[PDB]
Amino acid sequence: PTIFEERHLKYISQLGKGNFGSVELCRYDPLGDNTGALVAVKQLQGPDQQRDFQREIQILKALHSDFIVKYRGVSYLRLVMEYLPSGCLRDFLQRHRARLDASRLLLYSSQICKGMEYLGSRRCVHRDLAARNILVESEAHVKIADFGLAKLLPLDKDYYVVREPGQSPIFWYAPESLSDNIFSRQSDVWSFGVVLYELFTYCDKSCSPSAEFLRMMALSRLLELLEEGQRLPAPPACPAEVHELMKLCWAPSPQDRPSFSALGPQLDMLWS
Ligand SMILES: *C(=N)N[C@H]1CCc2ccc(-c3ncnc4[nH]ccc34)cc21
Numbered sequence: 590p591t592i593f594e595e596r597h598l599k600y601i602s603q604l605g606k607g608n609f610g611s612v613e614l615c616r617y618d619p620l621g622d623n624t625g626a627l628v629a630v631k632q633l634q635g636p637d638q639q640r641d642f643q644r645e646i647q648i649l650k651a652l653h654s655d656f657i658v659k660y661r662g663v664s665y666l667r668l669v670m671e672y673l674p675s676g677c678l679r680d681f682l683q684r685h686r687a688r689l690d691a692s693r694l695l696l697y698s699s700q701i702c703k704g705m706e707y708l709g710s711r712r713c714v715h716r717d718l719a720a721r722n723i724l725v726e727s728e729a730h731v732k733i734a735d736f737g738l739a740k741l742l743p744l745d746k747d748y749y750v751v752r753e754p755g756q757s758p759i760f761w762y763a764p765e766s767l768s769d770n771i772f773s774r775q776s777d778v779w780s781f782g783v784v785l786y787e788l789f790t791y792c793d794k795s796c797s798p799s800a801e802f803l804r805m806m807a808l809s810r811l812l813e814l815l816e817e818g819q820r821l822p823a824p825p826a827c828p829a830e831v832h833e834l835m836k837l838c839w840a841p842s843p844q845d846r847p848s849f850s851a852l853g854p855q856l857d858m859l860w861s
Pocket residue numbers: 604605606612629658670671672673674676677678679680721722724734
């Protein structure tokens with residue numbers, strides 16, 4: 590059931606691209622009559638990239654949570670995942686902003702936090718948490734996706750050091766990642782603070798992390814700004830308690846940031 594034959598996967602459209610791979614919308618149509626289910630299929634477009642892609646598959650296959658995109662199987666070559674037609678949270682917030690209130694944003698925040706607490710329990714560092722990588726299952730249910738940069742922490746170390754600087758938009762990186770390429774569950778907490786910012790701006794492009802940080806200010810300039818203690822401003826009409834939580838996520842030192850387990854009840858308290 591977790592083995593999909595290539596001949597049965599029908600190409601429909603492109604969902605995403607980047608980091609030497611692409612995600613396509615396919616129909617898994619073994620009957621060949623266009624009645625099959627839609628699936629999201631990721632493929633690689635080098636020998637290192639092959640190892641990285643195999644690692645992504647092994648990570649996602651071992652994750653079982655209502656708040657993590659579901660692994661469906663492999664085609665022998667491609668990673669088959671469930672397709673969420675509402676798409677990513679970034680675009681969903683822009684389209685439905687007039688219908689989503691603070692309570693709903695707090696509901697999404699709590700669900701992303703629960704997914705992250707679970708990832709951390711699996712020793713998994715996501716490294717690319719952003720609203721573009723969160724999928725909408727329904728009006729009241731989000732899931733974390735895109736494990737393309739995810740790493741598993743060894744049992745005796747709580748962080749990971751990368752040799753070359755990252756290739757992701759720099760506005761979600763923690764200072765220690767910008768300065769020393771150090772990643773941990775605590776740098777995912779920093780990124781989560783930026784996701785809270787994205788949620789409470791409804792992913793408005795005019796005050797997005799890139800637009801606002803660039804206005805405030807390149808990698809050396811952002812590191813300088815952050816080290817001075819400058820941060821993204823509270824989003825328009827943001828509840829004060831939410832902005833206070835973002836600032837805690839953005840503590841200069843990773844050991845001073847709250848854990849996802851500590852953030853969870855704090856978000857649930859604000860929701861109710
Ligand atoms: C928002 N615009 N998000 C897109 C950025 C690139 C990308 C890749 C894949 C998806 C996606 N959409 C729906 N269902 C899925 N299951 C797994 C991945 C996906 C969305 C985006």
